[PDB]
Design a protein around this nucleic acid. Sequence first.
RNA 1: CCUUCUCAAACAUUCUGUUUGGUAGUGAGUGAUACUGAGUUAACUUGAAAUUGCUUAAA
Lengths: 247, 133, 142, 254, 256
Amino acid sequence: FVRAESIVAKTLATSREKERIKRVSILEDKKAKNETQHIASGKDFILKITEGLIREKTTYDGKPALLFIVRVRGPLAVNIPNKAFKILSLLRLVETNTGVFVKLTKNVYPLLKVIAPYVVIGKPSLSSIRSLIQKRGRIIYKGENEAEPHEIVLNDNNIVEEQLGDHGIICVEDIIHEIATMGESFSVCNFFLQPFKLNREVSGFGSLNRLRKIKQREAESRTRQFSNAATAPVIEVDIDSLLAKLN
Amino acid sequence: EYSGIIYVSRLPHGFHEKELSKYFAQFGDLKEVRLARNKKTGNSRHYGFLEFVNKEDAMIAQESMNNYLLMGHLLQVRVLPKGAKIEKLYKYKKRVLVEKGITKPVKQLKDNMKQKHEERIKKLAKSGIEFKW
Amino acid sequence: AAETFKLFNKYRPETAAEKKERLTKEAAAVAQDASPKPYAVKYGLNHVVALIENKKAKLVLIANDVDPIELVVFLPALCKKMGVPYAIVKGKARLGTLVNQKTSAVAALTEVRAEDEAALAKLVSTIDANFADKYDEVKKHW
Amino acid sequence: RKLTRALGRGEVSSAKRLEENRDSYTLDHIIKERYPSFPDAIRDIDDALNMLFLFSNLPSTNQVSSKIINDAQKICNQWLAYVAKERLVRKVFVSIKGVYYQANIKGEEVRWLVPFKFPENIPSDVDFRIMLTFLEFYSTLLHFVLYKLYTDSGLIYPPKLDLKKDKIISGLSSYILESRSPVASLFSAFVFYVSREVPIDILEFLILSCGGNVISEAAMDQIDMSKVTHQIVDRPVLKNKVAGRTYIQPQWIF
Amino acid sequence: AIPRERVIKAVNELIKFTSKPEEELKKDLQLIVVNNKSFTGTSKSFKLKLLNVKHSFYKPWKEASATAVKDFKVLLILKDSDIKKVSEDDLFDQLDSEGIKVDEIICGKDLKTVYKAYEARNAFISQFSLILADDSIVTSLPKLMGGKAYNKVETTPISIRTHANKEFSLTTLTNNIKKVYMNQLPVKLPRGTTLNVHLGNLEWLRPEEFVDNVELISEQLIKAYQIRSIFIKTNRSPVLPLYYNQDVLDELEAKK
RNA sequence: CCUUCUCAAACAUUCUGUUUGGUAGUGAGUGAUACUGAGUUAACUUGAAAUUGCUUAAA
């Protein structure tokens, strides 16, 4: 059975999310058209939230940045709008507990604005990048005698040469260097690598794990921030600590 | 006696035609779901009507939802008697204003402004005021 | 019932650990002002009977499973003679959860916060429509 | 049972208090009963080391926890740090299944296997509860042995970790040990330069154990090459040479 | 521009009409200002324009309300994070001298919980007569305050400045409040051809300042708003034709 | 059974001013007085009132 309260709460939450995405779309349309006649403010803000909680508001330099984006489930009773759904699908972050590496430019800031309620954004350390590649690295690979391909681990180094040899990328450490240094062929290597499937922070429904889930939700409400204003700073957190937890 | 049509009132926000139809479908097949809406700015008026294939399904829905508390609203559901079905309540959007053609040119509208000033001139004395120009 | 308990769980009374913290603050301020006016549900049977007889109670919840039943069999009649809104709910255990006990015979709200006066009034009206008009005829028959 | 009661009644505060006011079992008395002789503990340390290194390489699943994996990795790093500091690696054998090391720990030959850093596909068809139980016992025994060895050799246990070097490259180099032949004297004043594709952990452990210092090209990616005496690099055809440097391969060191 | 002779004859005519052989409601002076292309456009605006005026009608409002049952009060909506730093006692110390009294210091959390009911919120909002809100929170107010508050020009909030540089400042707050009270006047800009200015009541204030107020209002609005028509008016009164332009109507068809 | 656009830019430093931009609202109803059937214009009643203009938030 489906309850009237569930229906109505979903409708209201989805309508509010649609309104927020609409006002963000209008603001970014005006910002891209470079008109400051009628605008709340004409620049891009980033909020570093680290450890209560200390916040720093900074202006985007504009220089491309290697961001790590981890999909988390958004607020309940919100059915994802089509714009956010398309952006997340293009980033291939459709299901929760996954992560990708993304280039950060002025062409990517508004996308982060639109997808903010469903993702966690950070700047990973080289240790985090190396741990991700060396522990959870999977690719789609096809065989000569195999009609249909299948996804494999990144165990073999010769596959790297035989697939991406013309870009000079020879090994897994070359892939890691390209990502960490944000050099050329980074997009090709990112496409080659499947989205990193992370593990749930707490699993199980015993009394101990239920208490852990309660504590985790408390900390999440402390850290993640949901704002519906178009002048919303892109929120970035200790992705390194999150990855040490999830990896 | 009783019909198969239901009047629903004291609705909260976010309970529109689609939401009402979705919720009351799991009671049975529906033939018409309509909601009162405001003309100028599209907004619900917190009442509506529903039509059931089975009058017994309609009565069951009324008994289920008669005095339901729903996010601060004490819903009201009544089975209507024979006839008196839904006749109106077309779903109205938020109306946007549209310009109308000014057939009267600059000269004609300036002469109209002159005549409006003349009407003020010949109206003030009858109203009971005395003032220059 | 879910709505009623969602209202009362905001007024679940002080636990022992919380009382130690509050007495810690008072001792700092001792050597009215030190602590604010508390809001909590009232739960003792004699206490609530007294509150009803003084008409201080705004809403009364009565467990349906009390043994001996003679302890609460007079409460609905008393609440009717006193004008206090009352409701019979399933579970002395559920009532006791509200007041940090294993079971509780009754619970009551006498004072509510400003942000909850309207919710209390709507809950009373809902119980009146669903519980007083619905069961008035049948509760008088064998 | 009592935590279940608190949660089912809704008293999250008392649930948190119960969780805080509890203590798990320890296994140190069991360690003492099983191994009364430090030589016997060193004797059986080998399968402990093997399982600890196996677990440190696994990803976290629904069964094996990130906490467990991180603890195992810490114990492995501490053991490697002690061995490299005291220079008691005697034999190294690179196989397909990782690398075997043989060390002279207090007169006992201790051999262990370290898997290569690749994402192994966990089968899950074997019982993980038993392996976790053995991992718990082996971790307790290895903590006992590590404390003993650190104190006897004069170091402080547990060593303080360096967070900036952990951020740079997680592994052996982070743990820094503060106090209070010909293998051990080999490679005196030799600067090796490790390119990207060379396994940095393996090479750095072997070099530090057998004397000499390391400069990793991978470790500079975060953000010299003037005093480098040797360079190790794997490539079909390398680029132009310094002509003042010396080139070697990992099998040369091995 | 407008000579004072027209204004004084208008005041004499208005007093003649208002002495006719309730009273306060029909005694209020409204300055109808009519624009060629409305005042904002196709997009609405609840922002209340504050205009610099020599004579402050709010002190006469205070006196008349003290004599009457209107009960003049000032509401001060602030940020949730600075309502703790603002104190009624500091407010009384810093505003007692200049004739400013802030009654209650409310919060967004108060509009979300204490008055999250239409009856209570309407009572609370309709009791006050002047509202001052931090310009940080004025943007979020229209959902918190509702539409019934913004409907009448008396109840809609006024955006005020309370922070100095990147942080809240009590001196900034008090200076802005005093300047708003004793130096500015509120109007709205509808999506319509005309608006009116609420100068006040004829009983409250003197023609010697009503003339200055109407002249300054007329000039300030016509300086930027391309005003064509300006009408003085009272309640249940005929329009008092004062100003008349023959210029802006040319661009009507150009836009058309 | 959700929970609400909680500040930006420049100019000046005068423990602070100026300008500019940012605010689309529960529904129903009474009502006066005008401005150009669409856009505007004082006050008024009310229970949140009302009869048809993604999936480990699972089981």
